[PDB]
Write a protein that binds this ligand. Structure first.
Ligand code: NA
Ligand code: NA
Ligand code: NA
Ligand code: NA
Lengths: 142, 142
């Protein structure tokens, strides 16, 4: 049973991410959520979730400067990918005031090219469906 | 074809409300969304949506003082109910920092008793499902 690991900051754990998780489940795609804001104690005990995931969906705080977010919070998520080079990484730039050019630069530097983004007056429900369709058709549909 | 009208402020139109709308649609429940922050010009042209709705779901900005919100923005929604006393009203106190006691007082004063609320570390996806189950079983299931 392949599954998806969604990583995020605590601010969207119970809002946007909860809808994303439920939409994946409705599609028949098992998933777990990892809050990157937890102590590195609990993170160590959660690393296996990320490492064993067939798909890693990183939901990024797109309103924030990547220079204060990536190394601090998300580098530890991506490093889990090499314990599984069958693992795909999908990135989501989420927020109502994206530092879009900054994040696109950041993701390119990290070698990440599969990117979904919040858009002006585009509904989050549509964004969720877009992420689900991508994960589903790429990895759970043949 | 009975339908639901969801009223809300612009801040949650494309986030929480979009998930609520999509969840109602998945359940087979037709629905439309009215943004209460629009000009009273466009509101007049949207009154019919509210008046003809079998269920009016008011998604309220629960982090805000009801004394600055209700009369200003939502009284005009509830007044549409009497053009249809077959119309039920469901209220949702949405926000991550609810002025809960203030809003409960406000709703009681308005004669409204069907109330869903954001809860500490309770997912919005669950809140949506709760609202959908209530609307569905009360009005679209016999
Ligand atoms: Na779920
Ligand atoms: Na997308
Ligand atoms: Na929809
Ligand atoms: Na509820």
């Amino acid at each position: 049973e392949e599954f998806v690991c969604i990583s995020c900051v605590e601010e969207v754990r119970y809002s946007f991410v909860s809808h994303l998780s439920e939409a994946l489940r409705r599609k028949g795609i098992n998933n777990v959520v990892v809050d990157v804001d937890i102590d590195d104690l609990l993170f160590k005990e959660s690393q296996a979730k990320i490492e064993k995931a067939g798909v890693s969906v990183m939901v990024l705080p797109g309103n924030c400067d990547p220079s204060e977010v990536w190394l601090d919070k998300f580098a530890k998520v991506l490093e889990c990918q090499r314990n599984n080079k069958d693992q795909a990484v999908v990135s989501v730039l989420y927020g109502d005031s994206l530092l879009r050019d900054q994040w696109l630069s950041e993701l390119d530097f990290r070698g990440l090219s599969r990117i979904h983004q919040s858009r002006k007056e585009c509904s989050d429900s549509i964004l969720v469906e877009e992420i689900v369709r991508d994960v589903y058709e790429t990895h759970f549909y043949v």
